[PDB]
Design a protein around this ligand. Structure first.
Ligand SMILES: [K+]
Ligand SMILES: [K+]
Ligand SMILES: [K+]
Ligand SMILES: [K+]
Ligand SMILES: [K+]
Ligand SMILES: [K+]
Ligand SMILES: [K+]
Ligand SMILES: [Mg+2]
Ligand SMILES: [Mg+2]
Ligand SMILES: [Mg+2]
Ligand SMILES: [Mg+2]
Ligand SMILES: [Mg+2]
Ligand SMILES: [Mg+2]
Ligand SMILES: [Mg+2]
Ligand SMILES: [Mg+2]
Ligand SMILES: [Mg+2]
Ligand SMILES: [Mg+2]
Ligand SMILES: [Mg+2]
Ligand SMILES: [Mg+2]
Ligand SMILES: [Mg+2]
Ligand SMILES: [Mg+2]
Ligand SMILES: [Mg+2]
Ligand SMILES: [Mg+2]
Ligand SMILES: [Mg+2]
Ligand SMILES: [Mg+2]
Ligand SMILES: [Mg+2]
Ligand SMILES: [Mg+2]
Ligand SMILES: [Mg+2]
Ligand SMILES: [Mg+2]
Ligand SMILES: [Mg+2]
Ligand SMILES: [Mg+2]
Ligand SMILES: [Mg+2]
Ligand SMILES: [Mg+2]
Ligand SMILES: [Mg+2]
Ligand SMILES: [Mg+2]
Ligand SMILES: [Mg+2]
Ligand SMILES: [Mg+2]
Ligand SMILES: [Mg+2]
Ligand SMILES: [Mg+2]
Ligand SMILES: [Mg+2]
Ligand SMILES: [Mg+2]
Ligand SMILES: [Mg+2]
Ligand SMILES: [Mg+2]
Ligand SMILES: [Mg+2]
Ligand SMILES: [Mg+2]
Ligand SMILES: [Mg+2]
Ligand SMILES: [Mg+2]
Lengths: 254, 243
RNA sequence: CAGUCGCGUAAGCGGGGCAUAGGAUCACAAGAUACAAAAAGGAAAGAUCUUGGAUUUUUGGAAAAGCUACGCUAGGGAUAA
RNA sequence: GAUGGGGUAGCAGAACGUUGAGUGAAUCUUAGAUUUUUUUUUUAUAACUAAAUAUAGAUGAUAACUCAAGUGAGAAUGGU
RNA sequence: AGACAACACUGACUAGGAUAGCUGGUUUUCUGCGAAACCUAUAAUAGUAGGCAAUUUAAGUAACAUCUUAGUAGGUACAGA
RNA sequence: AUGUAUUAAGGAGAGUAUAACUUAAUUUAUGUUUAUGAUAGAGGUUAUCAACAUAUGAACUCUUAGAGAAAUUACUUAAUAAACGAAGUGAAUUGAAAUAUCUUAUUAACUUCAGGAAAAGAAAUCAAACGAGAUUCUAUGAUUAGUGUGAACGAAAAUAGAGCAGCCUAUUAAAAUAAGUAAAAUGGCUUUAAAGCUGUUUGAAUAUUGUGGGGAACCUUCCUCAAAGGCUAAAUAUAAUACAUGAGUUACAGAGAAAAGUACCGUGAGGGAAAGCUUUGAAAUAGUAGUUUUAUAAGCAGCUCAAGCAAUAAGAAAGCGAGAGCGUACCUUUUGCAUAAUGGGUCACCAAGUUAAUUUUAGAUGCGAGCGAAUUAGAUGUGCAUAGUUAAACCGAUCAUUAAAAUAAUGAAUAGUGUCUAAAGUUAGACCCGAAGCCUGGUGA
């Protein structure tokens, strides 16, 4: 079949409420290890700082006078003191601050983004959720935190406990790998809840996700709108002349 | 186990790395593949050096010159123009101007000094079109008209073609009128535009003027000629009779 | 093969000499070709073809004299006592 | 009941090891992780078994795959 | 006196800025193949380039080597005057 | 190392509560918040058991009045390093396989002057018949045009980005619009012959009602601009300080300096160290212990054969080895080395095909007559290929030569492009170590 379904769940209860349809070239591509490899190694080269510096014999401090007479000493002839053979000499082929970044075609990088997204779809590790996804922290606790009655120490000591027992019930905690929450924008509860308890998972903004982030944890919990915006930006391989992108087969029962 | 711990490139993609001067059993050890105490081992030989013998470029000399004033045309064939019309990429009902030729991808993404229509596949071209190019071969002018079309070779420049695709200049297959009579007619057309549109330049040199002033090339300036007049600005058609 | 000349009845022969011993480019000079002509019309200076002047004789083509026992450095023992 | 088997200059292919990084908020460790040694085995530039000595819960070690090099020294009247 | 000018003077010391067709050195293992010291040119003859030609692995083969049979080129050893 | 922010004169001597810094070397006050902070006590030397903010007393000598042998004299409310900027002057090593033109190189260096930056700057600019619209910095354009015998050197238009600002009534005080000037000859610089700079000798014109300059020898038409008068912030250079980042260093590393321009060397200019911590303890080397062999023998000390000794005990033989035989170290360099040819006292550590740009190839892989990049509606951003041919254009699936042409012949025609891995050509230190010498600025009688 050319199109594959994508169930949309309600994050708190994980109830299937809507059904969307995506192309088979979006979430059902063959697994290409070479293509995924080239996109992961391409991202590491860009994150590298590449600033290591070393001095050569033409940069080491000191005078370029000849150390000893050419003849008559009875020792090996020597020139300047900055030679690689001397004690404090410079490294000939030492590291220098340069650019470690490589290039990768946009169409190849966009194929690896959808190949890593299909690897999670066929394994059941891609759980799309309705927009607005945020950790449903208790209401009374949120009333105290905002009030300022609770201290910072206790405010963090509770979130760490709730997030732990909330992720173990869902079997999404450190036991079953970890979870990555990908939302459109930053959310207070979600992002602040996974900054204090990071062993259970992490949260990321759509603009801060890489092909490597889609393969690290155990599952990817992405919003409905975020997923559509991720495939629309990484379909340069497909739309060059369309394919089903978020078509609603079953609408939410208002 | 983990997906990140199981990814790799195809084996054929990887090639042996040769680190010279790292032992005898590597095959590139002591001398590192240089030989034994020569100029190629101690220093470097100039690339142009032949041992002292004079090169052929000096014995024979460099022949000819490189023309720095020749125009660079984007060659377009009828074999390819027909394929674009059958595919729905060039609407033949409307005039096929340079703006529509460049934005169609038929001559590529490179804009050059002009576009010349060649006559490859002229025997299979039977679509009536109204094309306007910079030049056209004799074999293409008859094929375009044999099918019931119209062709006009206008004068363009590299900057003029860019402004056409950029919308900064409107296309027109007629030269600018000269004379006091037309001053108003043209000024009125400019006011109604309500937008700054650059004008397409006209040929100023002797050659370019003569190229578009003759009917053989279907030049846009051919009207300025008489049935007995010649396109040349200097030569004239002699008279044959008893004198 | 094309062009067009000579000799010969004709067939045919002739792109120097019975054969084997005369160096380029660049620059310069004399002719032709009509290619390009730095806004444009011309031109200059260039390009193509033909041709000429060379102990360019270290003749695949640098405009070039010596001393050191006051001597120096890098090598060779690939050449000496 | 396949064929082939010395090698300098030199050309070519396939690997190991070293240092750092990714997977790694991973795995293992007083029921002994790590211990420059000794020992045992395995077609083995390597790892492994066991022993002896000391005592760490991570600023510890680590398989596998991949990434990047200040990556491999009996030879320079070499340097410290 | 080529004497002296603060270890140095046929031109001091010091800082900055070189080259060396020359000499020496160039670090782990396994596996496969495997030369040349000849020709031509060179301000060359310790060098270098182009060939011959070592290697890699793809297209070809009426390839290449050897013998047999038939044929051909050319004048040595020998022998002769 | 880079980036960001802020700032725009640096050092020394001697002295002092030895965390406290200037003979006052631990001054004196104010406001706020103080555990829900900030990021109901004890303690004035048994001290500073308080942080932030805002004020405040003191702060010596020399560089630095004059003199002089700087830190002295004698006087007195005496006082400003380097790097970067501009102009002037201006080499040589080097390459061309020598070497003169050339290159190195409007370089290094020196001199002057100037500020926190400076310089430059709102067209007598570029373009080409369409138009752009000051200066400065980065990239492409561009191993291009072009010059040069060569080796090599080498633009601009334009595009992208950083900034963006225009004016004379200049936001700081300036013009009655510029004559010994433009320009020419000649001697040079620069350079493509133009334009620009310049010593010498000469020497114009008055605005598109077409006056003057420029558009790369030169004339002409046209286009464009308006010299001989000026102002202007930002993006840029350098240094100091703070902070951020790191498949950067972790003690022979990083820096020359983890207490450093100190110790020490030199008359001097100048040269210039070693050295961390409580952890771990490798090899070489030295003195011993256990097992074993050794005083009739001519061993690169290994290898082949091997008696015997060696475990107080059931089991279990590592090691040392008499005796017999084989074997003339290693590397480099050479036709050829045990060579009495080169190099090494031993061990440990440092120590050599790397990086960038550009130009290619193979393999793998993405797209595909397109590729790549870059981006409500439109446009925007190098390049390569898609058509070949010729000296070159016209021409064109045909083109070139045949002084007219013409199948007469001959030659040339069919998937590209991006990325990764690896090997490479070119230019840079270019795999590493090593000269004698040349030039410039300083030092010393
Ligand atoms: K004498
Ligand atoms: K020469
Ligand atoms: K050129
Ligand atoms: K002015
Ligand atoms: K030891
Ligand atoms: K020795
Ligand atoms: K190394
Ligand atoms: Mg020097
Ligand atoms: Mg160092
Ligand atoms: Mg890489
Ligand atoms: Mg070899
Ligand atoms: Mg080689
Ligand atoms: Mg090679
Ligand atoms: Mg050698
Ligand atoms: Mg050689
Ligand atoms: Mg002209
Ligand atoms: Mg000769
Ligand atoms: Mg010859
Ligand atoms: Mg054999
Ligand atoms: Mg072999
Ligand atoms: Mg141990
Ligand atoms: Mg050594
Ligand atoms: Mg004498
Ligand atoms: Mg003397
Ligand atoms: Mg063999
Ligand atoms: Mg031989
Ligand atoms: Mg010669
Ligand atoms: Mg030589
Ligand atoms: Mg005979
Ligand atoms: Mg004073
Ligand atoms: Mg004074
Ligand atoms: Mg430039
Ligand atoms: Mg004026
Ligand atoms: Mg003048
Ligand atoms: Mg002029
Ligand atoms: Mg001039
Ligand atoms: Mg002028
Ligand atoms: Mg001109
Ligand atoms: Mg150090
Ligand atoms: Mg250490
Ligand atoms: Mg005995
Ligand atoms: Mg020896
Ligand atoms: Mg070390
Ligand atoms: Mg090392
Ligand atoms: Mg290969
Ligand atoms: Mg072409
Ligand atoms: Mg005296």
């Amino acid at each position: 079949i050319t199109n594959v379904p994508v169930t949309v769940y309600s994050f708190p209860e994980l109830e299937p409420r809507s059904l969307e349809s995506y192309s088979a070239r979006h979430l059902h591509l063959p697994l290409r290890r070479d293509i995924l490899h080239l996109a992961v190694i391409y991202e590491g080269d860009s994150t590298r700082r590449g600033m290591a510096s070393t001095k050569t014999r033409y940069e080491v401090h000191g005078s370029h006078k000849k150390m000893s007479p050419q003849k008559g000493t009875g020792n090996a002839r020597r020139g300047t003191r900055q030679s690689p053979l001397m004690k404090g000499g410079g490294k000939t082929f030492g590291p220098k601050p340069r650019d470690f970044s490589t290039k990768l075609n946009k169409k190849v990088y966009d194929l690896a983004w959808r190949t890593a997204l299909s690897y999670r779809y066929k394994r059941g590790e891609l759980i799309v959720t309705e927009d607005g996804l945020d950790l449903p922290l208790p209401n009374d606790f949120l009333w105290l935190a905002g009030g300022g009655k609770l201290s910072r120490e206790l405010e963090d000591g509770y979130v760490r406990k709730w997030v732990h027992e909330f992720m173990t019930s869902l079997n999404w905690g450190k036991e079953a790998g970890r979870t990555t929450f990908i939302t459109g924008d930053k959310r207070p509860n979600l992002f602040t809840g996974f900054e204090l308890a990071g062993a259970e998972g992490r949260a990321l903004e759509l603009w801060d996700v890489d092909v490597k982030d889609l393969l690290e944890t155990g599952r990817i919990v992405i919003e409905r709108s975020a997923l559509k915006e991720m495939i629309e930006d990484h379909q340069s391989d497909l739309v060059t002349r369309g394919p089903n992108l978020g078509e609603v087969l079953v609408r939410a029962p208002r | 186990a983990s997906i990140l711990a199981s990814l790799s490139d195809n084996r054929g993609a990887y090639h042996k790395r040769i680190r010279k001067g790292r032992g005898p059993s590597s095959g590139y050890g002591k001398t590192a593949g240089r030989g034994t105490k020569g100029q190629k081992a101690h220093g470097h030989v100039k690339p142009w050096f032949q041992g002292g013998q004079t090169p052929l470029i000096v014995s024979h000399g460099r022949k000819g010159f490189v023309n720095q004033f020749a125009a660079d045309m984007s060659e377009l064939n009828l074999e390819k123009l027909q394929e674009w019309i059958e595919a729905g990429r060039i609407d033949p009902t409307k005039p096929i101007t340079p703006k529509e030729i460049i934005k169609s991808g038929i001559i590529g993404s490179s804009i050059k000094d002009g576009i010349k229509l060649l006559g490859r596949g002229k025997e299979s071209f039977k679509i009536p079109v109204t094309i306007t190019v910079s030049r056209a071969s004799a074999s293409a002018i008859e094929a375009i008209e044999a099918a019931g079309g119209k062709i006009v070779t206008r004068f363009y420049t590299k900057e003029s073609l860019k402004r056409l695709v950029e919308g900064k200049s409107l296309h027109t297959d007629k030269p600018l009128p000269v004379g006091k009579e037309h001053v108003e007619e043209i000024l009125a057309q400019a006011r109604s535009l309500k937008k700054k549109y650059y004008r397409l330049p006209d040929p100023t040199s002797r050659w370019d003027i003569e190229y578009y002033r003759d009917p053989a090339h279907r030049g846009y300036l051919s009207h300025q000629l008489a049935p007995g007049e010649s396109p040349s600005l200097y030569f004239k058609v002699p008279t044959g009779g008893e004198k």
